Design an enzyme around this catalytic site. Structure first.
Site, PDB file in Angstrom:
ATOM      1  CD  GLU A 156      -2.572   1.707   0.250  1.00 33.59           C
ATOM      2  OE1 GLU A 156      -3.453   0.898  -0.120  1.00 33.59           O
ATOM      3  OE2 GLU A 156      -2.375   2.806  -0.298  1.00 33.59           O
ATOM      4  N   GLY A 278       3.993   0.592  -5.750  1.00 38.58           N
ATOM      5  CA  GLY A 278       4.347  -0.206  -6.944  1.00 38.58           C
ATOM      6  C   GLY A 278       4.715   0.742  -8.086  1.00 38.58           C
ATOM      7  CB  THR A 377     -25.275   7.274   1.787  1.00 39.45           C
ATOM      8  OG1 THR A 377     -25.696   6.108   1.067  1.00 39.45           O
ATOM      9  CG2 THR A 377     -26.244   7.361   2.996  1.00 39.45           C
ATOM     10  NE  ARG A 402     -24.945   7.165  -7.512  1.00 39.05           N
ATOM     11  CZ  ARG A 402     -24.116   6.487  -6.723  1.00 39.05           C
ATOM     12  NH1 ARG A 402     -22.907   6.127  -7.146  1.00 39.05           N
ATOM     13  NH2 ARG A 402     -24.500   6.169  -5.497  1.00 39.05           N
TER      14      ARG A 402
END
Ligand code: FAD
Ligand code: HEM
Ligand code: HEM
Ligand code: HEM
Ligand code: HEM
Ligand code: FUM
Ligand code: NA
Length: 568
Positions: A156, A278, A377, A402
């Site tokens: 991470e 990464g 939400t 949406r």
């Protein structure tokens, strides 16, 4: 003192924080954080001493075990991670203003000397599979590969776990589950497939949508077996029936799912490495994966030798410069995302030969809080709230898709609107108490009083709610054709939240097949390279349904880990 180390060394030796030879333990700073805790106590113990009524730096919604050095550096000033989304009144010793300036993959090409030195050295580790990213897709792949007999390393880039997945609220879609049956809901994988294709304007890869619908119940079962509560089932926009699964009483799905995945990784002793980015997938002379070059914030460049790499790096919705080149209508908008969600994983994929698709399709969420700048939400509407304008009128079907919801809101006076609800709606969805705690849901015992407070026509607002409640009673919305009318707004007090659209989810990304294998522009598989979650394209077509991203990341993450293990 100018910094935290200077403060401590007034009365302590170097080895109060450091190992015997002075070397940093690893990029997670495991040893060094252990020393903080030995004198100050755990994060929970520190939190007892820093309480405010409505917030606490040391007790937040973040899952996992948050390291002290995430915010407190030793030898330089440091930043409060919470400042990337909120503006709480804090007084952290040795603080500086929040600023994120992370170099691009292309900019890192200038580290030629250091990178060539690393690649000339022995690999630091030799394992079966490396997983890139600690969101839902990455944890799922790491657990499933481990259970299939593979040795894994999970990396991470951020100081904290969870990506955007730890923020998820409204729910995880599936059909036809035991949980649905217990709540007297009738559904089918077929109906979920049909809703999804229609939602995406039939642009979706049908083979990938078939994996999404058909594996959905198994993925709810898998999470439940690992300890998750997915027993509450609500409605979101574009669904024919209630299928959005979340914890008892309507709590947030995201922080819970990530906490469960983290606990399961710890149980299996999975090697998880923080502050580790990464950079470059390594391939052999025949074009198959042989490992990955990474950059540790504290330990520098090194490489890992492995048969397979799984890219689980999420989307690019935080990166407004990249968003605006693909969809100019979203230039200058605020976003819902964590500060690292900028698309560097896609750059890694392309450099390794992977093709991208559907990149032009980018989703705005219709309801971010104007006051707090965070996602509110869709489940607030699903459970019964309406939307009104400054004139105190309804103006749209609140559970439409949406794009139309965002367009409708932007067309109103001031380019914003208000969610309106009562205590019956509040009691049905515990997530609402979080918005009240944040201070973004003003309240009154009448709609005239509430309208006066917020700048909404009070008489019109009162008549608007009386009319809506009549439509609920009769069972049909003749004004806007809202197809689901669950509650009358008539119990206790009333609440308003000012809302406006913001950049949210990137539907496009790396091209994968049904085995999560990454493909090039000629549609040829790159052996040993996999992709899972928001980093991929083709699953959601032109528009994603609410609840379908958490479904995607568990299903595709789990299958990628199994396929990579079999390949290795
Ligand atoms: C506020 C909010 C609420 C949401 N609510 C819902 C909901 O209720 N239901 C739903 O279905 N969806 C919801 N979504 C969408 C959903 O949570 C995201 O699509 C999901 O987070 C995708 O998960 P992921 O595992 O693919 O990526 P993430 O969870 O974003 O994790 C990717 C991780 O990889 C990292 N990373 C990136 N590049 C590198 C690199 N080069 N090296 C190492 N690490 C790297 C990270 O920094 C990040 O931690 C919501 C999104 C937001 C922002
Ligand atoms: C580990 C890196 C670590 C951190 C982080 C940390 C935090 C911390 C802060 C923010 C303060 C306040 C500084 C100020 O007022 O300007 C503070 C102060 C004290 N600390 Fe600490 N601390 C870390 C590590 C350690 C360790 C290893 C020791 C002891 C060997 C230690 C102890 C103390 C003491 C004593 C203070 C003064 C206040 C007090 O609690 O008496 N810390 N620390
Ligand atoms: C890790 C367990 C950790 C320790 C230890 C630690 C220490 C610490 C101290 C001692 C203080 C001062 C307390 C006092 O005034 O008596 C302090 C204050 C703040 N910190 Fe902290 N801290 C640890 C972890 C973290 C992390 C992970 C964050 C950010 C998410 C963070 C931030 C802050 C902030 C902000 C303050 C000021 C609090 C306020 O003004 O209310 N710390 N910390
Ligand atoms: C004592 C005076 C002391 C010395 C000397 C010292 C050295 C040191 C170096 C050289 C580094 C960088 C190593 C590298 O880049 O590979 C480093 C980094 C950190 N240190 Fe330190 N340090 C001394 C004292 C202390 C004290 C008292 C603490 C804790 C309060 C501490 C902790 C840390 C941490 C954490 C790091 C990582 C980088 C950072 O947060 O600044 N050290 N130190
Ligand atoms: C940093 C560690 C941090 C803290 C502390 C914090 C606090 C916080 C509070 C007090 C609320 C109100 C509700 C509650 O008591 O839990 C709240 C709400 C939301 N937050 Fe937060 N927050 C921290 C960090 C961050 C960051 C970095 C983000 C964005 C990437 C973020 C997002 C949100 C969102 C969304 C909400 C709305 C309520 C919810 O979804 O639960 N927070 N936070
Ligand atoms: O809870 C929400 O509004 C977001 C849902 C989603 O993006 O799927
Ligand atoms: Na995508």
């Amino acid at each position: 003192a100018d910094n935290l180390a200077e403060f401590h060394v007034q009365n302590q030796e170097c080895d109060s924080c450091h190992t015997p030879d002075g070397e940093l333990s690893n990029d997670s700073l495991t040893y060094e954080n252990t020393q903080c805790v030995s004198c100050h106590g755990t994060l929970a113990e520190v939190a007892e001493t820093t309480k405010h009524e409505h917030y606490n730096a040391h007790a937040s919604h973040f899952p996992g075990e948050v390291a002290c050095t995430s915010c407190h550096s030793a030898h330089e000033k440091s930043m409060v991670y919470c400042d990337s989304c909120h503006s709480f009144d804090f007084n952290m010793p040795y603080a500086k203003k929040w600023l994120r300036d992370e170099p691009t993959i292309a900019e890192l090409a200038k580290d030629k000397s250091e990178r060539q030195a690393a690649l000339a050295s022995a690999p630091h580790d030799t394992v079966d599979v490396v997983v890139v990213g600690s969101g839902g897709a990455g944890f799922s792949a790491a657990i499933s590969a481990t259970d299939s007999g593979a040795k894994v390393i999970l990396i991470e880039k951020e100081p904290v776990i969870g990506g955007n997945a730890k923020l998820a609220a409204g729910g995880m879609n599936a059909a036809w589950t035991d949980q649905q049956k217990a709540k007297k809901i009738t559904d089918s994988p077929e109906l979920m497939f049909e809703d999804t294709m229609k939602g995406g304007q039939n642009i979706n890869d049908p083979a990938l949508v078939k994996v999404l619908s058909s594996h959905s119940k198994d993925s709810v079962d898998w999470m439940t077996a690992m300890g998750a509560d997915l027993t509450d089932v609500g409605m979101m926009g574009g669904a024919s029936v209630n299928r959005a699964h979340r914890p008892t009483g309507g709590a947030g799905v995201g922080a819970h799912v990530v906490q469960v995945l983290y606990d399961n990784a710890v149980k299996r002793n999975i090697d998880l490495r923080m502050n580790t980015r990464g950079i470059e997938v390594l391939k052999d002379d025949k074009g198959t994966v042989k490992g990955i070059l990474v950059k540790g914030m504290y330990k520098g460049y090194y490489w890992v030798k492995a048969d397979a790499v799984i890219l689980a790096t999420g989307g690019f919705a935080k990166n407004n410069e990249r968003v605006a080149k693909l969809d100019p209508s979203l230039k200058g908008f605020i976003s819902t995302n964590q500060p690292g969600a900028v698309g560097d994983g896609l750059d890694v994929a392309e450099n390794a030969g992977g093709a991208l698709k559907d990149m032009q399709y980018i989703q705005a969420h219709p309801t971010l809080s104007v006051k707090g700048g965070v996602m509110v939400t869709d489940a607030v509407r699903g459970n019964g709230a309406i939307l009104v304008n400054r004139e105190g009128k309804r103006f749209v079907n609140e559970i439409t898709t949406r794009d139309k919801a965002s367009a409708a809101i932007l067309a109103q006076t001031g380019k914003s609107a208000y969610l309106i609800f009562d205590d019956s709606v509040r009691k049905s969805l515990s997530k609402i108490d979080k918005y009240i705690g944040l201070g973004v849901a003003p309240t009154a015992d009448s709609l005239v009083k509430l309208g006066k407070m917020e700048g909404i026509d009070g008489k019109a607002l009162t008549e608007t709610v009386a009319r809506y409640n009549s439509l609920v009673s009769s069972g049909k919305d003749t004004d806007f054709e809202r197809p689901n009318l669950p509650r009358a707004l008539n119990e206790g007090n009333y609440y308003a939240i000012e809302v406006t659209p913001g950049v949210h989810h990137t539907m496009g990304g790396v091209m994968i097949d049904t085995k999560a294998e990454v493909m090039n522009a000629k549609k040829q598989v790159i052996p040993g390279l996999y992709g899972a979650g928001e980093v991929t394209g083709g699953v959601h077509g032109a528009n994603r349904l609410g609840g379908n991203a958490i479904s995607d990341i568990i299903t595709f993450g789990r299958l990628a880990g199994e396929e990579a293990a079999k390949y290795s």
